[model samples]
Target chain A: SQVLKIRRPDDWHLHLRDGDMLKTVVPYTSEIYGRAIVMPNLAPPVTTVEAAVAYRQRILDAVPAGHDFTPLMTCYLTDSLDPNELERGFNEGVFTAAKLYPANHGVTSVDAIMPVLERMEKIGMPLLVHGEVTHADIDIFDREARFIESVMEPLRQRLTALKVVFEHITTKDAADYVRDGNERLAATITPQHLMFNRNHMLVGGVRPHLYCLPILKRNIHQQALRELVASGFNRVFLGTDSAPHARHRKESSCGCAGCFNAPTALGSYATVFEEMNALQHFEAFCSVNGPQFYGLPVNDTFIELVREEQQVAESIALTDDTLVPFLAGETVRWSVKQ
Target chain B: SQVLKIRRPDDWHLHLRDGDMLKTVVPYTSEIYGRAIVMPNLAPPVTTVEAAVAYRQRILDAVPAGHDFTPLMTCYLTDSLDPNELERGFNEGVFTAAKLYPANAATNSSHGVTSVDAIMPVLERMEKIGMPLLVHGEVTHADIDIFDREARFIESVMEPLRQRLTALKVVFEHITTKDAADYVRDGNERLAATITPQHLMFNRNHMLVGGVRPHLYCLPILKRNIHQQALRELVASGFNRVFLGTDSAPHARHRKESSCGCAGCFNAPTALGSYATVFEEMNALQHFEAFCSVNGPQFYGLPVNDTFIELVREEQQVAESIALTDDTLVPFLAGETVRWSVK
Candidate 1:
C-alpha cells in the first residue's frame, strides 16, 4: 500500500523554548504529535510548578485552535530543587518527569537530587536524563559511553524503582545498557541519532545543523542504534529532540547544539523504519511504546504516512532570522500526510 | 642557560600565497628562517621554470629588504605535467622539489594531481635526479573518514608508491597520525616526514572539545590525543628524518570563521616558539636544532644555515589577527601566550 496509517504518535522528548521562538515552533509538534514531553532547558529553565504551569499555558495558547495536543511539561532539576514543589507538580499533572543535565549540575547529581529522586521513585515519576558527561577529561565522542558507567548505572542502581528514560541514546554502550535493563528502564532515541553519525557533522565541512550534545557518535554506534530500533524494541520510541536555533546562531564560529527536526521528524523516522524493513513495528514504536510507559491510553487519532517524495524545506522562519531544519534541502521517501 | 641557540631553520613545507598575502606573510618566515620551501598550490600554480622563476622573484621582492632570505620554489604536479619542465626547474635551482596534492585533498588543491600513476614519467624523472617529492598525504575520497585518511593513504597510496619509486625521495608533509610516523620511521633514508607544530601539540580534542575552533582546523585534520602523543614521542626520541614543516597556510578570518570554514592554521607567526615549547616539554631540547634547522637541509641535500637563531625562555603574546589584503588572517595561537620566544 502507498499509505501507512497508525495511531497519532507522541514525542517522548522535545525542546520548545519560550516566547516567539516557542510560539513559532509549538505548532509543528502540535499538528503532528498528540503529546510531547516539552523540555525545561530554557534560558532560566522551568524550575517551579508555577513556571511549568505558565509554560504549559503558553504552549496551549500557541497550538492552533481545535488541535487536540497535550504539552506534557517536565521539571528542570537543579542542585537546590525542593522536593515538595516537585511532588506538587507531579501530583497536579503539571510535570511528566524531571530532567537532569549532567554538566549543568548532574555530574555529582546523585547526591544533589537524593531527596528529590527518592521522592520521584516513590511517586513513580520518570527521570529524563540528557545522558552525557561534560568533564573536560572525557573525549567528546566518549562522553555518552562514559556517562553510562559513571552516571546512569550508578544512579539507576541507587534508585532501583525509579522509572528512568535515557533520553537520546547515542552510543552502542548506551543501547546495550538499556537493552539489558528491567521494564523500569526505557530510552528515547532522537531521529538524528538513528539517521546520521559523526561523519555527517564533520565530513565535507562542519555541518553545524547536525551538531548536538550527546553529539552524533561514530558509525559503529550509529549502526548499533539503527539495529536496536529495527529490532522493534518496545522501550525505544521516537523523540525528535527538535531543538531550534536561529540561522546566525548555528552558522557562527561556535555553533549551538540540537537539530531543529520538528518540521521533518516523522518523515525522517518513517524513512529510517522503512530502511530497516521494520514497517510492521512502526505503529507500536511511534504510537504504543511512549503512552504505555507513561501509563496513559494510546492516542485515538490517526496520522498517515504516504510513500511520496517529500523534499524538506531548507529553512523556516523562527523570528526575524530563519532556522535550518533537520535534513534541510534533503529528500525523504515517506512524509506524514497532512 | 636561559637561551638556546641553533642554526637558523628552514620550513620544508609552507604556503606563501602570491600578491598581497605573499607580501604580508613572507616576513614572518624570512625573518626567522634562512630559507623556506614555499608551496606551489596558488590559483594557477608555479608549473614551469619561467613560472617558478617569476614566483621566486615575487617572494624575494616580498621579503623585507634587510632580510637575507631565499624562497625555494616547487612545481605543482597536475596529471598533465611534463617530465622535462620538472627536470629543468630542479636543475636550474629555480625549483626545490615537486608537490603532489591528491585531488581535492586540501586548500587551493582542486587542480591537484589525480593519482601517482598519472604522472609516473615525471615522478620517475625526479626520482632519477634525486629531487625530493613533497606529498600532501591524504586520499580525497569523500567516503573515507577524515580521521582515517592519513592512515588509509599510507596503506593504499604511499606504501605502494614507495615500493614502485624505490629510489625517489619523498617528504610526507604535515603528517598527523601515529601510522604516518611509524611508516616514515620504518622506511629508509629516502623516506622522511615533516611534522607541523600544531599537529605535535593539539589533537582533534583541542579543535572540537569546547567548540568548533576553526583556527586549529587544518588539512589531514587533527587526530586523537594518542596520535598527537605518538608524534611528540617520535620527535622526542630523536627520529632524525622528521623535521619542521609549519604547513602555515594563511586564510582570511572571514573565510575561516564562517560556515563551511576553510582548512589550515597560519602558524608562521609563532612556529619557532611553539616547536620549542613542544621540545622543551618532551625534554628533547638537545635534539631540537636538528629538527628545526639541520635535518631538513640534510635531507634536501643542501647546507645548514651558517647563522644561528636564539630561543629564549620568555613569554610571547601572539596578536589576534594579521592584515591580509582587505580581510584579516587569524593566525594559530592567536591571543595565546607561548612560553618560548624567538630572540
Candidate 2:
C-alpha cells in the first residue's frame, strides 16, 4: 500500500470546551496534531493571561497520558480589553495572541478594537477574527461576504501593518481579499466549507448537522474556496475551527452553530487535498505555513497516513452529551496511521 | 370586538390525502373554504375520470354534517394517460381539469407524467376544450438544485409547452420565485398562478436558521428572502391571477421529523388566518376577498360563492398536532397564534 508521511500538523483554530468535555475531545487532536491555536471564547472568555494560563493547564491536563501535544492559547478580545494584559501574555509566553469576534463590537464598529489592534500591530501580535457580521437586516447566508465589504476592507485600510488571520473564511470574496492583500493578511479554511455548501444543508429537507456559522455558502463559492486552496496559495492554511456541539444541542428547535470536527478533520482535509492532486502542498498548509506565519519553529515530529478507506464514527460519546463528528458516517480514502 | 367577514374562499391547491387522512383533514378546509381544488396524487393517483369522481365522493362523504363544501376534482397526469378519459371528466364535471406533476417530482410523484412532450396530445385537446391545467411547477431532475427547480421548470417545461399549446389555461401551482411571478404576470391572460401562505410568511431562513423545521418544509421548498419578498409583493399588488393555494399537504409527524422527511406543510388549520396575517402585514386587506374567493372561480369560469364567513380578531393557537390512525400531523402554525379565526 502507498503511504505518505509529513511533519505533524497544527490546527490553527480548534475548540476543546472545559471540564470533562475538554477531556473527551482533546485526544482527537492531540493524537494527530502537534499543536493547536486553542480558541478562548468560553462562556467566560480567557481574557486575562492568568485565566488563559490556567485554561492552558487544564488543556494540558486533559491530554492523554503519552500524547505529546501543546495547546497554544489565545486571549479573547472583548470591546474593552486592556492591551497590556494581552501584551504581557505574548511577552510572557502564555498567550499566542488575541481574537476579534466582530459581533462583539456592535457597540462600536470593529474600529472599537483599533487601539488594541494598533498596539498589537506595533508589537507584532496576530489578530484572529471570526469573519462575520451580526446585522439582523443582512441575510444569514450573505453576512460573511457583507462583512468583507462592510468591515474587513475598512479594517485593513486603517491598520495596514496589523497581522490579521481571517479565521474560517467561507466566501470567494474573502479568498480573493486575502490573496490580493498585503503579506500581513492570511486565512484559515475549514474542512466542512470545502466538503459542502448551502445546498447540502437545505435542498429537499433541512439537514441541521451540516450547518455552521459564516454558514456554508453556495456551490459556486464552495468551488472557488476549493480552487483557491488547491492553487498552492501559501497564505491559506489548515484550521479546522473544529468546534463541537452536543448532538441534542445541534438537533434542537434552536440549534447552536458549530461542527465538532477534530476527530475526522485530518482525514477529511486529506481527502480534499487528494482530490485536488495538491498533496505536495498539503504538508505546507497543514504543517509548514502555520508555524512560519506565527514566527515559530516547525515541529520535529511527523505523522503517517496509509492510503486506506476509513469510516468516521457517526457520533462520539462525551462525558455528558454525544458529539456528532463532521461528515459523520462518511468514508474517506485516507486514514492517519496511529 | 372587531370582526372581518369576506366571501367564503376556495383553496386553489390542497391535498386531503385518502380514506381516513381525507376524513381527518377535509373538515378543516371545508369548514373555511367553500370549495377546494383537490389534488389527485394519491397512492394510486386519480388517473382516470372514474377514479377522480370516486375520490371526490370520498371527500364529500367525509365532510361533517351541515358543512356546505364542494370538492372540485383534478386528474393526475402520468405517462400515456388517455386524453379521452380527461375530456370525459371535464365534460362531465367529474374533473375540474388535469394536473401535471413531473416524473419523480416528489414523494407522491414517482408515478407522475414523465414528459410534457408526451402529453401534448392531451394538452392540445384541453386547449380546444378550454380545460385548465394545474401544474406542480418543478423540474424533477436529480441534478437541478431545489431552489432552481421552479424557474427551471418554467423554462424547460412550461414556456416550451405554452408555445406549442396556448390558451390551454395553466395555473403554475405554489409558485415560490420572482422568476415565476414575473413570468405568470407578464404571460398572457391564459397564464395564472397560486401563491401559498408559507411562501409569503417564511423563507429558507425560518426553515433553516434555527433547526431543520420540517413543518415549514415543502417541495418547491421555501426559498431565499429575496424570492419571499418578491412573492409577497406579487400578491399584495392585487394581481388577479395570483391567488391563494394553501398547498396544505399533511404528512405524519414521525415521517416529517425523520432523517429524510416528507416535503409538505400542514396548513389547512391555519390557512385563512395565515393569509389574513400576510394581507394585514402588506396592508392589502382590501385585496383579500379577490385573492381568497373571486380570483379562483373566475379562472375556472365558475360563479363566485355568495356565502360569507366572519373572522374574529382573535388569537387562535394551532393544536400541536392532530392524530391520524397511523401517526400524527403537525400543523403549519402549530404552537403559534394566528391573529384571525373563521367564525
Candidate 3:
C-alpha cells in the first residue's frame, strides 16, 4: 500500500526550552507527536511541583487549538529535593517522571540520591536520566560509553526494579546494555545519532549542527543502533531531542550543542526505518512499546502518512532567531497525510 | 637563564593567501620565520612561472625593509601540468616545490586532483630532477574516516605513489596522526613530514569538549590524545624527518564561526610561542633548534638562517582578533596566556 497509518507516536524524550523558544518549537512536535516526555533542563529548571505545574500550563497555553496534543512534564532533581513534594506531584498527576543529571564525582553523585530512586520505584513513578559522566576530564565523546560501566550498570544493579528511562542513547555500548540489562531499563534513540556519525560533524571541517551532548558517535555504533531498532527490539523508541537554539547561537565561534530537529523528526525517523526495511516493525517502536513500557494507554488517534517525498524546510522562523531543522535542505521520503 | 635562543626558524608550510591578506599576514610570518614554503592553493592557485614570480614580488614588497625574508614558492600541481614549465621555474629558483591537493575525482589541476594516474608523470619528473613535492596527504574519498584519511592516504595513495616514484622527495604536509609520524620516522631520508603546532599541543577534545570551538578546528582534524602524545614525543625524540609547518590558515571571524567552520588554524601569530611551550612541556628544549631551524633547511638542501630569535619564559595574551578587511580574524589561543614570547 502507498499509505501507512499508526497510533500517533509520542516523543519518549524531547527538549522544548522555555519562554519564546518553547512557543516557537512546541507546535512542530504537537502537530505530529501525540504526547512527549518533555525534558526540564530549562535555564531555571522545573525543580519543584509548583514549577512543573506552571511550566505545563505555559505549554498548554501556547498550543494552537486543533493540535490536540499533550505534554508530559518531568521534574528536575537536585540534592535539595523534598521526596514528599515529588510524591505529591506524582500522585496529583503534575509530573510523569523525574530526571537525574549525573553531575560531578561521577554517578557516585547519582548514587548519592539512591534515596530518591528507591522511593520512586516503590511509588510506580519513572526515573529519566541524562547519562553522561560529570567528571570534566572524561573525553566528551567517551562520556556515554563510559557512563554505562562507570555509573549505569551499577545503578540498575542497585535499583533492581526501578523503571529507568535511558534518554537519547548514542553508543553501541549503551544500546547493548539497555537491550539486555533488565525489563525495567528502556531507552529513547534520536534520529541524529541514527542518521549521522561523528564523521559528518568532523571530516574536513567542523559541522556545528550535528553536535550534541552524549555526542554523536562513530559509524559502527550508529549501525548497531539502527539494527537494534529494526529487529523490533521493543525496548527502544523515538526521541528527537529536537533542541532548538537561534541561528546566531548555533553558528557562533562558541556555538551551543544541539540539533533543533523538531520540524523534520517524524519523516526523518520514517526514512531510517524504511531503509532498514523494518516498515512492518515501525508501529511497535513508535506507537506501542513506549506506551506499554510507561503503563499508559496507546493513543486513541492515528496519524496517516503517504508514500510521497517531502523536501524538508531549510530553516524555521522564531521571534529572535531561525531554527535550522533536521534533514534541512534534504528530501525525506515520507510526508504526513492531512 | 630563563631565555632560550635558536637559529631563526623557517615555516616549512604556511599560507599567505594573496593581496591585502598577504600584506597583513606576511609580516606575522616574516617577523618570526626566516623563510616559509608558501602555499600555492590561492583562489586561482599560483600555477604558472609568471604567477609564482609575481606573487614573490608582492610578498617581498610587504616585508619590513630590514627583515630579509624569502617566500619560497610552490607550483600548484594540476593534472594537466606541463613538466617543462615546472622544471624551468625550479631551475630559475622561483619554484621551491610543488603541491598536491587530492580533491575531486575529475580535475586535472594539481589544485584538486582525485586520481593519481595522470599526475604520476609530473611526480616522476620531479623525482628525476631532484625537486621536492610538498603534499597535504589526505584522501579525497568520502568514505574514509576523518582520522583515517591521513594514514589511509599513505596506504592507498602515498605508499603506492612513493613506490611509483621511488626517488621522489615527499613532504607529508601538516601531518596530524601517529600513523603518519611512524610512517615518516620509518621511511627513507627522502621522506619527511611537516608537523603543525596545533597537532602537537591539542587533541580532538579541545575543539568540542565543553563548547563547540571553531578556532581549534583544522583538516586532518586534530587526532585523539594518544596521537597528540605520539607526535609530541616524535618531535622530542629529535626525529629529523619531522619539522615545522604552521599550516596556519586564517579566515575572518564571520567565516570561521559559521554552521560549517573552515578547516585550518591561524597559529602563525603564535607559532614560535606555541612550539616553545610544547618543547618546554616535553623538557626537550635541546632538540628545539633541530626541529625549528636545522631539519627544514637540511631536507630542502638550503642553508639554515644565520639569524636567531630569543624566546623569553614569560606570559603574553594573544589579541582576541586581528583587524583585517575580510572581517576580523580571531587569532588562535585568543585571550589565553602563553608560557613563551618572541619579540
The numbered model that scores best in TM-score is 3
TM-score of each: 0.93, 0.92, 0.96
Model 3 chain A: worst 10 consecutive residues (lDDT sum)? A103-112
Per-residue error for A216 in candidate 3, Å, reads: 1.6
Model 2, A1-338: lDDT tens per residue?
76889899999999888988888899999988899999998888888989998999999998888988999999888778887887889899988878877653322557666778788988999989887776655667777888888888888888888888999989888988988978889999999999888767766666667777778887778888888889998889999988887877766445677888888878788888889998888899999888888988888988898889888888899777688887788887888997
Candidate 3 lDDT at B17 equals 84
Q: Arrange candidates by DockQ, descending.
A: 3, 1, 2
Residue by residue across A230-301, what tens digits does model 3's lDDT show? 989887888888888888888887888888888777777888899999988898888888998899999989
- CAPRI accuracy category, model 3: medium
Interface RMSD of each: 2.0, 2.7, 1.1
Ten contiguous residues minimizing lDDT sum, candidate 2 chain B: B102-111
Candidate 3: which pairs clash?
B77-B110, B78-B109, B78-B110, B79-B108, B79-B109
Tell me each candidate's RMSD, in Å, in order.
2.8, 2.8, 1.9
What are the runs in model 3 whose C-alpha is more than 4 Å off?
A: A104-108, B108-110
Which 10-residue window of candidate 1 chain B scores lowest in summed lDDT?
Answer: B103-112
Candidate 1: give the clashing pairs.
none
Tell me the tens digit of each residue's lDDT in model 3 across B209-255: 77788888888788888889889999999889889999989887887
Output the number of the lDDT-best candidate: 1
Error of 3 at A130 (Å): 2.1
B255 in model 3: Cα distance from truth in Å? 1.3
